[PDB]
């Protein structure tokens, strides 16, 4: 089994309610334990951010995040603003950086 614990993240100057009709909960919604980070208004520049979490507990933690590959470059600049996007993830023994590959999938 699994026990969940709040990461305790706090967002300012963006939208944290990105949802979809493919995840129905009395209308559109998203993953329960994730949040779809959106720009504060369509096509607006996404402010560069940095958030951090410490594992205080005695057993290791399962951290899961998502890189979003939008349908089109146009949609990508609609949700997160224009320009190149980059997401870097850091820990004591892990440092990878992801670039979204937008494009059409079936």
């Amino acid at each position, epitope marked *: 089994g699994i026990d969940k614990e709040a990461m305790g993240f706090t967002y300012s100057g963006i939208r944290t309610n*990105g949802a*979809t009709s493919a995840c129905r909960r*009395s209308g*559109s*919604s998203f993953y329960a334990e994730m949040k*779809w980070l*959106l720009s504060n208004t369509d096509n607006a520049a996404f402010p560069q951010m940095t958030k951090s979490y410490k594992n205080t507990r005695k057993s290791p933690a399962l951290i899961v995040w998502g890189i979003h590959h*939008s349908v089109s*470059t146009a*949609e990508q600049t609609k949700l997160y603003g224009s320009g190149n996007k980059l997401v870097t993830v850091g820990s004591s023994n892990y440092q990878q950086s992801f670039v979204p590959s937008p494009g059409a999938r079936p």
Partner: antibody, heavy 120, light 110 residues
Framework: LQLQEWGAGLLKPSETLSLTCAVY????????WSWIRQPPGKGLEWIGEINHSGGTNYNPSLKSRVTISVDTSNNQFSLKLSSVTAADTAVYYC???????????????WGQGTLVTVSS | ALTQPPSVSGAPGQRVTISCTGSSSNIGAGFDVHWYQQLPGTAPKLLIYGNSFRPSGVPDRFSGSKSGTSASLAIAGLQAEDEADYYC???????????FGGGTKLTVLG
């Protein structure tokens, strides 16, 4: 799912068009809630939308002139257009928009429509 | 920025096509195009969404598509009750919002 909007009819230029639309059979926060207008001759224009949280999505060409509020309690959402010209004479609809990413993707269950003639 | 023809003819039954021509910023991106049926004096109703998917109430007749920078609706099986105005709709990033077409007027015999 019922959808019917009421408010001001005739108003003269430089006034403030105010409308308000009521819903029956559904609930906010599942979708977006949009106002879409249609001039009497031709066309169809999306003026803006809002969600339960008060999160708006406004048409940039009508920003600084439009404000959409939401009465989460009374199952109705409003419309404020602020310095009305004669170009604003049109039919005004309210409609529910399917929330897909950022703001809505298509519109299901449109309202009925009210005419707003703005002439002097 | 969705250029539709203003008029389409048609005898009952015969298939008839409605163009929805758009630019590289609305349908020349991943934005789906949908359609809406406005019967005279009434509100619009939702026709085809997701470029082909029809909702509950729409007959086999109504069939749509999207290709390159444009879409095309097809009314095969023209009944009398299809007299209405049809609009397409998608998302334009240059306007940062949702756009409709001018509209096409569906006229039947006799």
């Amino acid at each position: 799912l019922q959808l019917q909007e009421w408010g001001a009819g005739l108003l003269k230029p430089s006034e403030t068009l105010s409308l308000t639309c009521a819903v029956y059979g559904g609930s906010f926060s599942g979708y977006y809630w949009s106002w879409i207008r249609q001039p009497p001759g031709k066309g169809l224009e999306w003026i803006g939308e809002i969600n339960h949280s008060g999160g708006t999505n406004y048409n940039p060409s009508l920003k600084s002139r439009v404000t959409i509020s939401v009465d989460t309690s009374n199952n109705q959402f409003s419309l404020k257009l602020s310095s009305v010209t004669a170009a604003d004479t049109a039919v005004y609809y309210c409609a529910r928009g399917v929330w897909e990413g950022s703001g809505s993707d298509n519109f299901d269950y449109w309202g009925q429509g009210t005419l707003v003639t703005v002439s002097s | 920025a969705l250029t539709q023809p203003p008029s389409v003819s048609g005898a009952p039954g015969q298939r008839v096509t409605i163009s929805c021509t758009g630019s590289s910023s609305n349908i020349g991106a991943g934005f789906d195009v949908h359609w809406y049926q406005q019967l005279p004096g009434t509100a619009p109703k939702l026709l085809i969404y997701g470029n082909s998917f029809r909702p509950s109430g729409v007959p086999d007749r109504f069939s749509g598509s999207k290709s390159g920078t444009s879409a095309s609706l097809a009314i095969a099986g023209l009944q009398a009750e299809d007299e209405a105005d049809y609009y397409c709709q998608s998302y334009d990033s240059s306007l940062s919002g949702v756009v409709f077409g001018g509209g096409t007027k569906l006229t039947v015999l006799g």
